[PDB]
Structure formats: C-alpha cells, structure tokens
Design a protein around this ligand. Structure first.
Ligand SMILES: [Mg+2]
Ligand SMILES: [Mg+2]
Ligand SMILES: [Mg+2]
Lengths: 4, 335
C-alpha cells in the first residue's frame, strides 16, 4: 500500500 | 481431480471452463499464477456425470513464519458457492491435492453476504471472516468485502457511459473531455510504461509502496489485448492519469490506477468513462470499481467511486477458511  | 499443468489438453479444457463460466474470475485463471510467479500453483476441478468440468479452484500456496503453507484461491472457487454440498466436494479434492502442506485453504468468492449463507458455511465446518473481523490492518480480509459494482444489465439500451447517469453526473464526466483530456488504450509496452510512471508517482506522493514493473509485465504476457487493457489519459501532450482494467467472465474490473501530481483536469473521470464504455461495447454485465473502506464521504475511495456507482456497495461473504492445522491457524489468524 494491498490488493491483487 | 488435480490439474496436470504439463498436459496441454487438460489445461485447455480447464481454461475453457474458467473463461466461459458466468462465475469466472481473472484471479482464478491459470494466467494469474503466471503473475503471482512467487507462489506455487495447485489447481483442482470436479466433473459432472458426463465427464465435463462443473467446478474448479485455482489455488496459490505461499510461505508463512511456520512450517506450513497458506493456500489461497483468490475470488474462487468458480462455481455457485451457495451450492455448499458441491463446494464441499470441490474442497475435498483441493485438500487431497494440498497433501497436508497448508494450514488452511482460504477462498473469498464474490457472493453477497447474508446471515443464512454465513451460518450454512459454519454448519459445514468452515470458519468465516466478515463482520466479525477488523475493518483494516493485519487482521482484516485480504480483499475488501465492500465493493462498488455497476450493474450494466439495468440499462439494456445504453449506448454510451453517459446514458447510465443523472444529469449532475453527466456534467462531471464531460468536464475532463471538455477541458482537453484525451484517452487512448491498449496493452503494449508503451502503455505499460505510461501507467507505471503515474503509478509510481502516485505512490511516492502518498508515501506508500508499489509493485515492481515486472509484476505488470508478467500480467501483460499472460493476458491478451481483449482481456487486459491499459487506459491512458493525457491533455495536450501531458500525461495525467491511467488505469488498468481486466475483462473476464461477467465483468470488467478496474484493478490499478495512477495519477501525476498537481492539476490532473479530472482525468481519472475520463479513464473511468472509457473503461465503462469498453464494458458497454463488449456487452459486459458488470463494471467493478473495486473496494471502499466504508460507505462514508469520509472515505476518498467511496466519494470517487460513488460518482459512478449510485447503488449501495455490494458486501461479500468474505473469507471462507477450511481449517487444516488448527494450532497454526489460531496462531496466524485472529479477529
Ligand atoms: Mg515457513
Ligand atoms: Mg452493448
Ligand atoms: Mg451508478
């Protein structure tokens, strides 16, 4: 920063 | 059964099922394993009475501070997860394929949260993580449960992005184009370079980390121009903002974004308008803008995404955990  | 990744025929059959399923997810495509190349892939599937694939789950195994692996099927499995008996059978195949190497098999399908479904899952032995866990931090769900999804099927005759919005919003969307912002799109190395510059600039501005460019290069190598597309907004020679969208299954998903410092002339709105236009041009059912922290104007994510999604955010069931090693699970997972 998450996430794909 | 477990998919033999070295069997071209088997892989093609698995891929055809994934790509043609109304439950298909790009993160469940075998191409995702190529992007997350630092994870180990283990994929399983079930066949119906005629030998055709009826359900599948692409898992990725990652390391932990313990001797066990973390098995994760991002936004999987691909099937109707509310069909819990079928789900149990698919998970059994997955558990056999894991061969005791993981402490848990976690999957976070895009299915609406409901007390009924949450209870059924628990009744079948799964541990669910949704309203009971922290909203953010090391304890929060990996994927946000609240997502801003635009249901394009509500506008069957819509021809352009503008046809989906009230006048107040049509004005906001038209603003960047009126001011000279132009958007081009594709999936070439040039567009990736433009995206990366805005992506890293954005991260530096917020003082946050960012994924390396190789991550996106693997993504470009894994998906063709009809699946992955980078949108770049510029104004009279100046790069303003970009966004990456993936078209898969019943939706186009706004996955990554970047924006330069200073005046961006509302370029982000232009990018969104073109991504939505792509969804319309391809007769796609849904346009997914992703997660928000809360349905509050205090959240910048919500304020921006609420411009394009007036309906309430969708709230997913969250993480469904098939606990395999209870001790390690308790050590690594808490509310
Ligand atoms: Mg370890
Ligand atoms: Mg259309
Ligand atoms: Mg809307």
């Amino acid at each position: 920063x998450k996430x794909x | 059964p477990v998919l033999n990744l070295n069997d071209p025929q088997a892989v093609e059959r698995y891929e055809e099922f994934m790509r043609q399923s109304p439950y298909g997810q790009v993160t469940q495509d075998l191409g995702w394993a190529k992007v997350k190349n630092n994870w180990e892939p283990v994929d399983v599937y079930l066949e119906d009475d005629q030998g055709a694939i009826i359900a599948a789950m692409s898992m990725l195994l990652g390391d932990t501070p313990t001797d066990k692996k973390f098995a994760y099927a991002s936004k999987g499995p691909v099937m109707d997860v509310t069909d819990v008996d079928l789900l149990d059978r698919l998970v059994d195949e997955a558990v056999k394929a894991l061969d005791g190497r993981a402490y848990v098999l976690r999957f976070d399908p895009e299915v609406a949260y409901s007390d009924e479904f949450n209870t059924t899952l628990q009744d079948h032995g799964y541990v669910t993580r949704n309203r009971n866990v922290a909203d953010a931090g090391m304890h929060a769900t990996i994927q946000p449960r609240l997502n801003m999804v635009l249901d394009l099927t509500k506008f069957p005759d819509a021809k352009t992005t503008l046809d989906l919005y009230p006048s107040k919003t049509k004005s906001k969307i038209k603003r960047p184009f009126r001011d000279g912002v132009e958007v081009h799109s594709g999936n070439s190395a040039t567009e990736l370079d433009e995206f990366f510059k805005t992506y890293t600039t954005m991260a530096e501005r917020h003082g946050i980390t960012h994924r390396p460019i190789e991550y996106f290069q693997r993504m470009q190598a894994a998906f063709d121009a009809d699946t992955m597309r980078i949108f770049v907004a510029e104004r009279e020679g100046k790069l303003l903002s970009t966004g990456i969208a993936l078209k898969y299954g019943r939706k186009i998903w706004y996955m990554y974004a970047g924006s330069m410092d200073g005046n961006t002339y509302y370029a982000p709105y232009a990018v969104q308008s073109e991504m939505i236009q792509w969804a319309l041009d391809t007769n796609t059912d849904l346009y997914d803008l992703g997660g928000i922290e809360s349905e509050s104007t205090d959240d910048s994510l919500y304020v921006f995404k609420h411009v394009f999604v007036k309906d309430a955010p969708r709230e997913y069931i969250g993480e469904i955990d098939k606990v395999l090693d209870p001790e390690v699970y308790a050590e690594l997972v808490k509310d």
